[PDB]
Structure 1
Amino acid sequence: SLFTDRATNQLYVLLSGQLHPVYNLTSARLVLGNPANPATVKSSELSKLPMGQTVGIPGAPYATPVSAGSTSIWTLCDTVARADSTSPVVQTAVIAMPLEIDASIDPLQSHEAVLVSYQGETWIVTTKGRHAIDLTDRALTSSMGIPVTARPTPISEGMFNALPDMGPWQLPPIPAAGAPNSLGLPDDLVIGSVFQIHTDKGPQYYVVLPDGIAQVNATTAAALRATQAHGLVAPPAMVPSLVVRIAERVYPSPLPDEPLKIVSRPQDPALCWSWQRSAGDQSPQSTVLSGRHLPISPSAMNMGIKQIHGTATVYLDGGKFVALQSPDPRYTESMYYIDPQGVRYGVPNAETAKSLGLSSPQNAPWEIVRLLVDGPVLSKDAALL
């Protein structure tokens, strides 16, 4: 049984005939094994049983309330101040609540990108994640859509970890570039060369590979030729007749169809990685946002909770109960209760979760969730000391 003293609101749990003071309702439920609510009694009634030692986990949350919303939404945002200066400052926000997206803060379009720095190296950020880039040769990076005037701005450790590494911002290497083609094409069209065919939609460019030909967009055709033209002043025009017979392959160039547009960080200081998964979805969806401020409502902007011994300001609409999957380094499933102040507390297993009254956890991304300051693990074993 579980009692609350009417005079003091103090909790007591009855264990093996002794009343034990207990620090919080969370701890009481861990020791009882079910999400009990206290029975109110007059203070003097508690004198009728022998009093034992205090039990529970002092740093646990008082209880474990969770917010109604079923869709799991987690967003990490970097905001940079003094972006052009010698000393930019980055702030990071963790947002676990629905967003309000608009033209001032929205997903990067397929031809938009952000140039950033982290630990002395440079990366291109697109909708998909981050891509290594070497700014040593700016003629080369120009042909890959980066203007010579573009300068990187810093990202946070948290943002670097959250953005998936999608591979380098470069043309895929072509093995045997310069060697004669084995496809029956004219001798000038060596491996790694570009040609075109006229279509009703205009020119279609192709690159010659060891094992076939691959369609490339105009931007990629230009970048190929900028790096190595193989002696050709322009892509030779071939007839469909000669080409349709050749094996078609894929050439996985990262370059978008439209000329790349590089985001001005002084104008658009906010960069976010947004993740979401709804009940019953097979996989989550994520995207990168860019814009003027956090993707939250006018009034939500004032509700942030700074984690002083943490790294982020947290924006939450109530508690959360989440499941993570991470390679630590072996594949590990873990659960956390998140209190309404953004503190995460481990929940070791489903039996323990259910004793606390925490029904199915929501899948969430460890890259964002583990940025939250961690409190004590909520375990019966800890509670019973």
Structure 2
Amino acid sequence: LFQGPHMGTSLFTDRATNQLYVLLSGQLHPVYNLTSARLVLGNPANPATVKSSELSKLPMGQTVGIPGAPYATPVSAGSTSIWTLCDTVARADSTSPVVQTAVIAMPLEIDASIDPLQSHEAVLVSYQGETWIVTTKGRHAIDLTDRALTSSMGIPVTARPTPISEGMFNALPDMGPWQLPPIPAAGAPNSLGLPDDLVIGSVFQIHTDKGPQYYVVLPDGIAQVNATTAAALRATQAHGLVAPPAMVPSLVVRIAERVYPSPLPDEPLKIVSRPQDPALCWSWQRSAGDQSPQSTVLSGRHLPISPSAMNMGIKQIHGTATVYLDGGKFVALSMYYIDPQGVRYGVPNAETAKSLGLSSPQNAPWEIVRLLVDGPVLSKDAAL
């Protein structure tokens, strides 16, 4: 297993300056950081003390190293790899609503105030002039200028979009527009042996035990739709019917049954109020047990971490996000070392990793890692 430090004879540290020195080909070169020293030595050496006196006997050389590299490369105890991206919108009713972004690589604290979006819940979002609807699935294009459509899909006029960050926009998969699947032959007489009333695109119902079951009339059969979709269909075009005509179950039992893929949920749509729930998250995890990654959209009152973690947030100067980390990470998207201040440094190959004493990198999503400030590549070629 070989855990712990490397003990060599080529790396030294002064008593007063705490400056590092690396012994290269008999000549003592100085080095910016412990990270760079290990790059050139080819081993994760731990420095040995030495009073300035002994440094004098040996001659000095040109300084080597990577000034922008992290000092060392510590990693926390994981194991687990949970990566979460969060948008928090400040003053959502304002003029002037504003979004801030958090990157989180630590266990989450999920509760009723901040938890996954439920199936019937959705967030209206604005990005570069266009509006989108965010659900458990991802983001769907939606035209909020079109009140006829919005009213038909159950989106109230009180509903307002809030800005989503570029990072969160890119992290959310595109699920296609928020619309009812087209029925181009709609309004045309049916060919199923149904009454002439029930034209293609019309909605009927069968009265069962556990409440009515709605059906849309399609060219090649009848398709089951939920109440939401039935209401949606009829709101855009009812084809002259005050209500969906009732069907005796014996009349449709030999009609072909088809699927109508409405994105509308069973329960009535609930558009979340951003001033009430300003946080919108995309959370990703993939336990080392091989598998496939698992991602989920969260919505809530604040970040899904303990209140004590809130004081640990580091906002990078060269960056967009506040980063919440419980120690350094070694990840594979192509490998990166990520320091506790949330800077990513490229690790080009496995021998460079071995030199640094980094091993067993965790899988992590590029969608989140790329948002971290990009530091210099950790390479011996540049360490020299």
Q: Which TM-score applies when normalising by structure 2?
A: 0.92
What residue in structure 2 maps to residue 141 of structure 1? 150
Asked if the contact 1:94–1:368 (Cα under 8 Å) also holds between the matched residues in 2, the reply is yes
In structure 2, what is the Cα distance between the partners aligned to 1:382 and 1:271? 40
Deviation of 1:87 after TM superposition, in Å, equals 1.1
Deviation of 1:356 after TM superposition, in Å, equals 1.3
- Aligned to 1:199, the other structure's residue is in SS state coil
1:59–1:191 Cα change, 3 Å: same
1:77-100 CA-partner distances (Å, limit 9, x unpaired): 222222112111221111111111
Deviation of 1:204 after TM superposition, in Å, equals 1.2
In structure 2, what is the Cα distance between the partners aligned to 1:54 and 1:286? 46
In structure 2, what is the Cα distance between the partners aligned to 1:35 and 1:277? 28
Deviation of 1:280 after TM superposition, in Å, equals 1.3
Deviation of 1:171 after TM superposition, in Å, equals 0.6
Deviation of 1:49 after TM superposition, in Å, equals 4.1
Q: Which moved more, 1:285-294 or 1:374-383?
A: 285-294
1:138-161 CA-partner distances (Å, limit 9, x unpaired): 232122110122122222222222
1:98-118 CA-partner distances (Å, limit 9, x unpaired): 111222222221111111212
**Gap regions ≥5 residues in structure 1:** 325-333
1:28-65 CA-partner distances (Å, limit 9, x unpaired): 22222222222334433344544322111111001111
- Aligned to 2:212, the other structure's residue is in SS state strand
What residue in structure 1 maps to residue 13 of structure 2? 4
- Aligned to 2:217, the other structure's residue is in SS state strand
Deviation of 1:367 after TM superposition, in Å, equals 1.7
What residue in structure 2 maps to residue 337 of structure 1? 337
Deviation of 1:172 after TM superposition, in Å, equals 1.3
Q: How many pairs are equivalent? A: 375
Deviation of 1:340 after TM superposition, in Å, equals 0.4
In structure 2, what is the Cα distance between the partners aligned to 1:359 and 1:158? 28
1:328-350 CA-partner distances (Å, limit 9, x unpaired): xxxxxx22111001111111122
In structure 1, what is the Cα distance between the partners aligned to 2:355 and 2:256? 61
Q: Which moved more, 1:301-310 or 1:30-39?
A: 30-39
In structure 1, what is the Cα distance between the partners aligned to 2:253 and 2:18? 82
Within 5 Å, give how 1:256-275 maps onto structure 2: 256-275=265-284
The answer to which structure has the higher strand fraction is 1
Q: Which moved more, 1:35-44 or 1:56-65?
A: 35-44
1:183–1:29 Cα change, 3 Å: farther
Q: Which moved more, 1:42-51 or 1:296-305?
A: 42-51
Deviation of 1:321 after TM superposition, in Å, equals 1.2
In structure 1, what is the Cα distance between the partners aligned to 2:47 and 2:152? 69
Specify which of 249, 257, 260 is matched with residue 251 of structure 1: 260
Deviation of 1:10 after TM superposition, in Å, equals 2.5
In structure 2, what is the Cα distance between the partners aligned to 1:2 and 1:18? 12
Deviation of 1:122 after TM superposition, in Å, equals 1.1
In structure 1, what is the Cα distance between the partners aligned to 2:183 and 2:354? 56
1:247–1:34 Cα change, 3 Å: farther
Asked if the contact 1:338–1:345 (Cα under 8 Å) also holds between the matched residues in 2, the reply is yes
Asked if the contact 2:21–2:30 (Cα under 8 Å) also holds between the matched residues in 1, the reply is yes
In structure 1, what is the Cα distance between the partners aligned to 2:218 and 2:329? 52
1:111–1:9 Cα change, 3 Å: same
What residue in structure 2 maps to residue 241 of structure 1? 250
Deviation of 1:218 after TM superposition, in Å, equals 0.4
Deviation of 1:180 after TM superposition, in Å, equals 3.6
Specify which of 307, 310, 313 is matched with residue 316 of structure 2: 307
Deviation of 1:213 after TM superposition, in Å, equals 2.4
1:272-331 CA-partner distances (Å, limit 9, x unpaired): 22222211142222222222221111111122111122111111111111112xxxxxxx
Asked if the contact 1:112–1:261 (Cα under 8 Å) also holds between the matched residues in 2, the reply is yes
Asked if the contact 1:78–1:271 (Cα under 8 Å) also holds between the matched residues in 2, the reply is yes
Asked if the contact 1:175–1:210 (Cα under 8 Å) also holds between the matched residues in 2, the reply is no
In structure 2, what is the Cα distance between the partners aligned to 1:251 and 1:23? 64
Q: Which moved more, 1:237-246 or 1:281-290?
A: 237-246
- Aligned to 2:228, the other structure's residue is in SS state helix
1:169–1:39 Cα change, 3 Å: same
Identity of aligned residues (%): 100
Deviation of 1:223 after TM superposition, in Å, equals 0.4
1:338–1:224 Cα change, 3 Å: same
In structure 2, what is the Cα distance between the partners aligned to 1:344 and 1:193? 56
Q: Which moved more, 1:290-299 or 1:30-39?
A: 30-39
Aligned residues: CA RMSD? 1.9
1:182–1:361 Cα change, 3 Å: farther
Deviation of 1:253 after TM superposition, in Å, equals 0.8
Q: Which moved more, 1:315-324 or 1:288-297?
A: 288-297
What residue in structure 2 maps to residue 160 of structure 1? 169
Asked if the contact 2:86–2:279 (Cα under 8 Å) also holds between the matched residues in 1, the reply is yes
Deviation of 1:187 after TM superposition, in Å, equals 3.3
1:34–1:184 Cα change, 3 Å: farther
Asked if the contact 1:34–1:354 (Cα under 8 Å) also holds between the matched residues in 2, the reply is yes
In structure 1, what is the Cα distance between the partners aligned to 2:14 and 2:90? 52
Asked if the contact 2:148–2:236 (Cα under 8 Å) also holds between the matched residues in 1, the reply is no
Asked if the contact 1:17–1:50 (Cα under 8 Å) also holds between the matched residues in 2, the reply is no
1:148-189 CA-partner distances (Å, limit 9, x unpaired): 221222222222222222111111112422334343433333
Q: Which moved more, 1:140-149 or 1:15-24?
A: 15-24
1:340–1:197 Cα change, 3 Å: same
1:350–1:214 Cα change, 3 Å: farther
